[PDB]
Amino acid sequence: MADYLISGGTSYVPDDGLTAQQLFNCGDGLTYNDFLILPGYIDFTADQVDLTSALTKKITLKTPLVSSPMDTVTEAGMAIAMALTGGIGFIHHNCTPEFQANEVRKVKKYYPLASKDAKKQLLCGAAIGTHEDDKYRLDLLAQAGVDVVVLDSSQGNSIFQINMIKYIKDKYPNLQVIGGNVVTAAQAKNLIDAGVDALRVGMGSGSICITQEVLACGRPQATAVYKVSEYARRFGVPVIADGGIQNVGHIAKALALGASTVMMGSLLAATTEAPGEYFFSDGIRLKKYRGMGSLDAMIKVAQGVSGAVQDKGSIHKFVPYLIAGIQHSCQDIGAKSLTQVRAMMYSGELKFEKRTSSAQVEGGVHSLHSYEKRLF
Amino acid sequence: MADYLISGGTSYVPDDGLTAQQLFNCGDGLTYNDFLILPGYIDFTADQVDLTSALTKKITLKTPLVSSPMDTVTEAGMAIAMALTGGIGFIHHNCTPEFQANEVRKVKKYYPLASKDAKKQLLCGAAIGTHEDDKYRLDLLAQAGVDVVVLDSSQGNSIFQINMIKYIKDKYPNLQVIGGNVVTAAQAKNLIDAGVDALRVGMGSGSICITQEVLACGRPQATAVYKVSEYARRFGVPVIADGGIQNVGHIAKALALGASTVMMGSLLAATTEAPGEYFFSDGIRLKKYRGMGSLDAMIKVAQGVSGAVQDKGSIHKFVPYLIAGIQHSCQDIGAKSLTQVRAMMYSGELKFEKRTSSAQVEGGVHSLHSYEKRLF
Amino acid sequence: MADYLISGGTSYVPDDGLTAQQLFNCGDGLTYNDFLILPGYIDFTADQVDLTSALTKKITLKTPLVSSPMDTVTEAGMAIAMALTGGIGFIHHNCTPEFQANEVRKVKKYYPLASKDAKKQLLCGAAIGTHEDDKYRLDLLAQAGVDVVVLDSSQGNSIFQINMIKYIKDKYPNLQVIGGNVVTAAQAKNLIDAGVDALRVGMGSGSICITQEVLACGRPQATAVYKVSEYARRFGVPVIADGGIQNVGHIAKALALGASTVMMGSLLAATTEAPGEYFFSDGIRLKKYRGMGSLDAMIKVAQGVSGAVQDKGSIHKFVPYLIAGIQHSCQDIGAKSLTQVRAMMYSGELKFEKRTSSAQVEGGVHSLHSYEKRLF
Amino acid sequence: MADYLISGGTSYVPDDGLTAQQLFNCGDGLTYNDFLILPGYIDFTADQVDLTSALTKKITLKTPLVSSPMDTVTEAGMAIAMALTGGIGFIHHNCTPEFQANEVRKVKKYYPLASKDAKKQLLCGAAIGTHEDDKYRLDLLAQAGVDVVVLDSSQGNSIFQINMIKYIKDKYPNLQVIGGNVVTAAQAKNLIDAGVDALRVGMGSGSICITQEVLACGRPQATAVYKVSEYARRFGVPVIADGGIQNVGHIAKALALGASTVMMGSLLAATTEAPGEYFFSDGIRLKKYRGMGSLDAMIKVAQGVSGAVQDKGSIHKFVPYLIAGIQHSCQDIGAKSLTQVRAMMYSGELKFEKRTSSAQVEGGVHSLHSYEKRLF
Numbered sequence A, B, C, D: 001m002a003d004y005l006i007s008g009g010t011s012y013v014p015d016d017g018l019t020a021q022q023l024f025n026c027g028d029g030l031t032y033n034d035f036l037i038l039p040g041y042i043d044f045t046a047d048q049v050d051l052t053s054a055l056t057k058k059i060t061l062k063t064p065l066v067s068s069p070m071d072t073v074t075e076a077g078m079a080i081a082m083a084l085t086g087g088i089g090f091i092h093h094n095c096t097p098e099f100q101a102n103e104v105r106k107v108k109k110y111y112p113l114a115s116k117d118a119k120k121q122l123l124c125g126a127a128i129g130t131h132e133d134d135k136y137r138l139d140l141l142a143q144a145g146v147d148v149v150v151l152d153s154s155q156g157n158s159i160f161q162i163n164m165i166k167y168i169k170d171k172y173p174n175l176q177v178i179g180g181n182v183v184t185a186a187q188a189k190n191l192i193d194a195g196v197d198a199l200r201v202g203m204g205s206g207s208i209c210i211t212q213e214v215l216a217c218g219r220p221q222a223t224a225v226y227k228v229s230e231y232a233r234r235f236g237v238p239v240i241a242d243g244g245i246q247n248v249g250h251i252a253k254a255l256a257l258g259a260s261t262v263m264m265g266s267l268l269a270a271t272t273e274a275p276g277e278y279f280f281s282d283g284i285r286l287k288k289y290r291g292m293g294s295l296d297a298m299i300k301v302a303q304g305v306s307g308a309v310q311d312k313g314s315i316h317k318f319v320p321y322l323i324a325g326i327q328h329s330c331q332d333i334g335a336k337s338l339t340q341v342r343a344m345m346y347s348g349e350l351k352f353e354k355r356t357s358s359a360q361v362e363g364g365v366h367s368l369h370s371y372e373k374r375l376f
């Protein structure tokens, strides 16, 4: 009897570690490789973990991986491919509107967990601009049959973006929009009261964004995804993480801080289904990678740069490594779903820990003469 | 009279420094080269310090140095050698079971402080897997006559490992098991209540483990050895430190934070008794060094890498330098045994101090044009 | 009237900055380039600042610069030279006792502020070992007529060093001894109650000492000079700073934290009056520089290394730059003597400020393509 | 030598106690019997302490005791009396203007330290209202020859009071005004920039004011005198403490927190020179005592009450006890003048200490069956 009715079910479970709530009000600007996740008790293995997540308030996915809408990372090829592996892709807005019209008609008509609708057609998203000339851009791909759109912007709460939500939802109520870019709760309020359906958190944290050093704005991104998902839980709105993703660990860190889908732009760059084409340098196979703020887009200013990244193969051999990396991580946390790991984080059942620079210099590799970092 | 009976024996001993208990609840993730040990009063010299320590609850050793069970660092050669110098070795589990059966029969049959049993045969340990097919692996080396085994696992508290303790101790009660890998108190409870005999603390902190950056799990290791030895003192269970050992100072830091034996994998790599064989690169004598999580072990994922480390000579000329390095350190702390230095740490008689990055950049070498770092 | 008698003399003087007392109990291990000194009101210029300081409780100097007793930095040449510029030199103990006997007889027999005694002979100090065979070393240079000696030791409070003070002061009461190495208050008590005359604070902080990484002992040095001069003010005992001196700013930081004389070993290395001789490497004029813990001194261990430093000219053109660097610093603090700057620090009239790594990366030089760092 | 030039003059002086600056930003609302003053080194005795203080920026007094302008405490009698003992008195404004005109002409025409001007006539102050009909009140006693006036108001920074300063100082520039009532720095700025000459700090803290419980405004008074004298030191403006004075200890606490003169209304009530006349109750000699906010002044509200206090004798036998009580207190602090004790408080040479309720219940009298509290 009394082994049960002193507490009831729960054992002692000592108090070593920091929950996220007292981790992130310390005032430190945390990024991904500055905290990490402490392990706990497991009762399962790596393959029955239900890795489903939500992109908007209605449509949910079999994996939390989404491509970022730039022309140097995704078009209809990787939209097709990431749909067929479970994820979702967007399409950039620096082309003509008929170009993405044809791009969406290519991806829409056209693998067990392939993320298909009630029409059993593959999910497709896109992204539009913010200026009022894009109203003629928007209704064309609305005629093409897009599912979600992303208001790609450097800062979220303009009058322009709020008027675009109040322009879209009273015209196209079944069509669902993504707000962005939101990085605090203060601008997270003005989009949820606008009525937006999900948020896209993170500015200044990309591989190629220098706008933290040019415009002196933004935030560290792992203290941003936490507080935006903290405010956005109050209304049941999922958030989408941008920037600072370099590997598959940061995926799990963004997923355990409240973000439901992780948006990658560099880690999905230099793939077979990425647009453009290859060129060698020092004998290394690579392809170019640039951002919308870079002046290789078109009295200007530049928030992005233009560089290149070495090849990473086809995505159909790449995203199984990423979902297995999320699955082994969610096993070592101790939750057999992403819903359950966000439950354990909001309740405090898993606990984090800070790092120092001396702590991450041991976290990678050290005391070697040379090494061959082979990932899969 | 009254020079004595105001306090009694103890002098004033001013309050400069931080004891470990208020050092490690600051929430900072400390590693070894981020704190250090402040000196105190000595009354002895470097050679009568009784450097004995405990590996499990029954068998104790003349030195706290133990090799790590990987095939790229130890087999029966360095098992023989480190037994004959005082320490203990394990044997990896990525071979056939008859291979370690012959390996244990080679080391068991076969220098004053040579760590021998009541049969006056040398101590030998090993390590097994976790899956239930390893039951046929376990009883074969139990027939060979192993002393301790290590449940080598990335995370400790599975159902599988707890069922292995409850499978072993009711079959082989004199045989003693090592749990692992434990890194918090929360999983330190589920192995001690399972009935495990010692713990192996530290994940993600090796020279070649990238699982802090791949699976986003683990902990900084010097804030891990402290809290696991804090919880494991409550039941009288010693702990074993893994990873992040680069030199002989980190040995003393792990020993002064409550760990009783320090397990090394890279600092004992590239020795004469390490298996494999040498090959030059840039004219530097070196040999390869890889981990079990690396995919040079055999829909996969990789937590380790495969590299190489330059040669460090025979261990019989190497571990006297390591035990003399522990002895000079234990002299400069002010305790003539490791039992007494852990006593002084749990009571608060020695005190630590944090460092900054600017503090360790002076701690090594600086303001030189070139230097020849000669260790012994 | 009432402009005076509300406070009395003192103006408002706002409360921006941190005094040393609340700076150094934060628990951070501060080194020299991690804090700096905030300026205040001046009423003088750089040349009438009385830069006199104290070495022991009796003999005081016209400058706080003292050479460190190693054979690779000082002998009777730089003893003569630094005496003739104001400072004091010691003589290493890794030679035969007749060698320093002749060395002290060379420097003693033999420029306005030349630090001469009541005999009007130049001041000379030395250093002896700790073992009891050095009693025959000690009385020989006592016969030679040395002024102060330094008990050169890695850690201060042995029984051996305390018995050496109780062996010296009852035999040679006018002869004055230097304790060392002390780094906390806890060992600062056992030498002052032994009756030592000054302290030599700092271990593990040299340019060539690796004993923080080998023996895991020591302390960050700018949090060491503060607390040792804090405890040693209570008995009126000056302290001497070792290690971590790279330039002339760290001189002023050690002098403003309570240390009265700054002992340099690398910044006075590679000079004309340093012993040994020159040799080129890559066409750079340089000479070797090694420590007593390095195994180029003679079952061993090594706490120092052996390297080299590029040439810095004659000291008679070098220490005027150092005393002018202390003078401009003491001008910018706002105290026309070193006694007054330690008064302003113990009272709280000057205030410090922490730095971050991002703060010192701007403190040096940045945003240049190349630069020519010319010091004087 | 070196007993001096390590610090310079000052001895160690340990760090027990709290200076006022870190006492009063704790956020606690301190009153007088909630902190107290720790003693220090003395070098004098109780009678040569120069107890002079300042009332305005020009005229200074031989004692810091000033009566409060109510009709139930002071008129021309106690104005004459407290002038002749050193202090200064004001005259209430709830009479006709010709009444205080005659009152000031009685006190002005008319004992060694008797506070007389360059005309060798006794100092006299008064107080006027705030409404614009009081301009005819003001010039009449300006014709009578008053020295200072007090803008008696519940809250200080009205437009009305600032316009009264800008009405007075451009008409009557030699005439000096007192602002009030100020209780924070926020309203202390708007009167000093108005150009007021001293402040009268404290609202809601009187013996008879209930405006903290009626209007929910004010502040605890000993955390008010500190921060108003903190802001008013920046412009060299003295402040005057009201309310919460019950004895002679609170005088010393208000004087050691930066206030230069202490204004009493109840402790100078029930004296021989107080107006009105006596009446017995329970056989106890007493006289009535009421405030301006009480509706025994004339759609109303009431901030004061109307009561009575028992007799305390003539003031010429009473204020020598008060100045001897300030003198013994200033002796036990360790400053031979009030200017020097405010110097020691702003520099931090004296230190305070908080109390608890359990700490003041021992501070008075306890463990007695009865006691006869005889004051002088």
Ligand SMILES: NC(=O)c1ccc[n+]([C@@H]2O[C@H](COP(=O)([O-])OP(=O)(O)OC[C@H]3O[C@@H](n4cnc5c(N)ncnc54)[C@H](O)[C@@H]3O)[C@@H](O)[C@H]2O)c1
Pocket: A129, A130, A131, A132, A152, A153, A154, A155, A158, A160, A181, A202, A203, A204, A205, A206, A209, A211, A242, A243, A292, A293, A303
């Ligand atoms: N982490 C991120 O996602 C991130 C962060 C920063 C920048 N960026 C990229 O930078 C790109 C361009 O940045 P941008 O916001 O400066 O250009 P934009 O086209 O995205 O936004 C338009 C610019 O003009 C303003 N604007 C919006 N509507 C306007 C209207 N009717 N009239 C006049 N001005 C209007 C906006 O403030 C903005 O500066 C974006 O497409 C985005 O992809 C991305």
Ligand SMILES: NC(=O)c1ccc[n+]([C@@H]2O[C@H](COP(=O)([O-])OP(=O)(O)OC[C@H]3O[C@@H](n4cnc5c(N)ncnc54)[C@H](O)[C@@H]3O)[C@@H](O)[C@H]2O)c1
Pocket: A045, B129, B130, B131, B132, B152, B153, B154, B155, B158, B160, B181, B202, B203, B204, B205, B206, B209, B211, B242, B243, B292, B293, B303
């Ligand atoms: N610091 C360290 O010591 C450390 C840290 C991380 C990884 N590693 C190395 O990584 C190696 C492999 O890591 P690993 O744990 O992923 O492989 P493993 O063979 O050690 O463990 C088996 C894997 O499958 C799961 N498992 C256990 N029993 C199972 C069963 N009956 N059925 C199905 N699944 C079961 C486990 O969770 C684990 O992921 C380990 O041998 C270890 O040496 C070491």
Ligand SMILES: NC(=O)c1ccc[n+]([C@@H]2O[C@H](COP(=O)([O-])OP(=O)(O)OC[C@H]3O[C@@H](n4cnc5c(N)ncnc54)[C@H](O)[C@@H]3O)[C@@H](O)[C@H]2O)c1
Pocket: B045, B046, C129, C130, C131, C132, C152, C153, C154, C155, C158, C160, C181, C202, C203, C204, C205, C206, C209, C211, C242, C243, C292, C293, C303
């Ligand atoms: N910052 C510094 O100044 C610093 C710090 C560390 C080391 N060092 C250098 O390192 C040198 C050598 O270091 P060390 O202290 O190990 O050698 P040492 O000769 O200075 O001291 C003797 C060693 O044996 C022990 N000892 C002392 N008296 C003994 C006795 N009668 N019998 C037996 N043992 C005795 C001491 O603990 C010490 O380890 C020192 O000369 C010092 O210059 C300097």
Ligand SMILES: NC(=O)c1ccc[n+]([C@@H]2O[C@H](COP(=O)([O-])OP(=O)(O)OC[C@H]3O[C@@H](n4cnc5c(N)ncnc54)[C@H](O)[C@@H]3O)[C@@H](O)[C@H]2O)c1
Pocket: D129, D130, D131, D132, D152, D153, D154, D155, D158, D160, D181, D202, D203, D204, D205, D206, D209, D211, D242, D243, D292, D293, D303
């Ligand atoms: N600790 C203290 O000293 C203290 C604190 C509170 C109240 N009091 C006493 O309370 C007495 C009355 O308090 P009070 O301030 O309410 O009355 P008041 O006569 O002192 O002030 C006039 C009142 O009307 C307002 N006022 C000022 N000028 C005005 C103007 N031209 N036209 C219209 N309104 C104007 C003021 O806000 C105030 O409420 C005061 O005389 C004061 O002595 C003293």
Ligand SMILES: O=c1[nH]cnc2c1ncn2[C@@H]1O[C@H](COP(=O)(O)O)[C@@H](O)[C@H]1O
Pocket: A068, A069, A070, A202, A204, A205, A206, A207, A208, A209, A210, A211, A242, A243, A244, A245, A263, A264, A265, A266, A267, A290, A291, A292, A293, A294, A303, A304, A305
């Ligand atoms: O030009 C740019 N300037 C700033 N941010 C950009 C730019 N282009 C793309 N981004 C953002 O950077 C993210 C990709 O960052 P990554 O994870 O480092 O690849 C995208 O999802 C966008 O939100």
Ligand SMILES: O=c1[nH]cnc2c1ncn2[C@@H]1O[C@H](COP(=O)(O)O)[C@@H](O)[C@H]1O
Pocket: B068, B069, B070, B202, B204, B205, B206, B207, B208, B209, B210, B211, B242, B243, B244, B245, B263, B264, B265, B266, B267, B290, B291, B292, B293, B294, B303, B304, B305
């Ligand atoms: O492949 C791996 N991935 C993660 N950790 C490993 C791996 N192989 C060995 N380890 C751990 O790393 C430790 C050695 O770390 P080292 O002290 O840096 O050499 C071993 O004791 C193991 O616990």
Ligand SMILES: O=c1[nH]cnc2c1ncn2[C@@H]1O[C@H](COP(=O)(O)O)[C@@H](O)[C@H]1O
Pocket: C068, C069, C070, C202, C204, C205, C206, C207, C208, C209, C210, C211, C242, C243, C244, C245, C263, C264, C265, C266, C267, C290, C291, C292, C293, C294, C303, C304, C305
């Ligand atoms: O061999 C050694 N090991 C550790 N410390 C040394 C050694 N030799 C000299 N030192 C100390 O290092 C100081 C010089 O440090 P520097 O200021 O970096 O040159 C000397 O004053 C000695 O106290």
Ligand SMILES: O=c1[nH]cnc2c1ncn2[C@@H]1O[C@H](COP(=O)(O)O)[C@@H](O)[C@H]1O
Pocket: D068, D069, D070, D202, D204, D205, D206, D207, D208, D209, D210, D211, D242, D243, D244, D245, D263, D264, D265, D266, D267, D290, D291, D292, D293, D294, D303, D304, D305
């Ligand atoms: O009627 C009133 N209501 C609120 N405060 C008053 C009143 N009358 C006088 N005061 C203030 O109370 C102070 C006297 O407080 P005491 O020190 O307790 O006697 C005077 O100096 C006035 O500032």
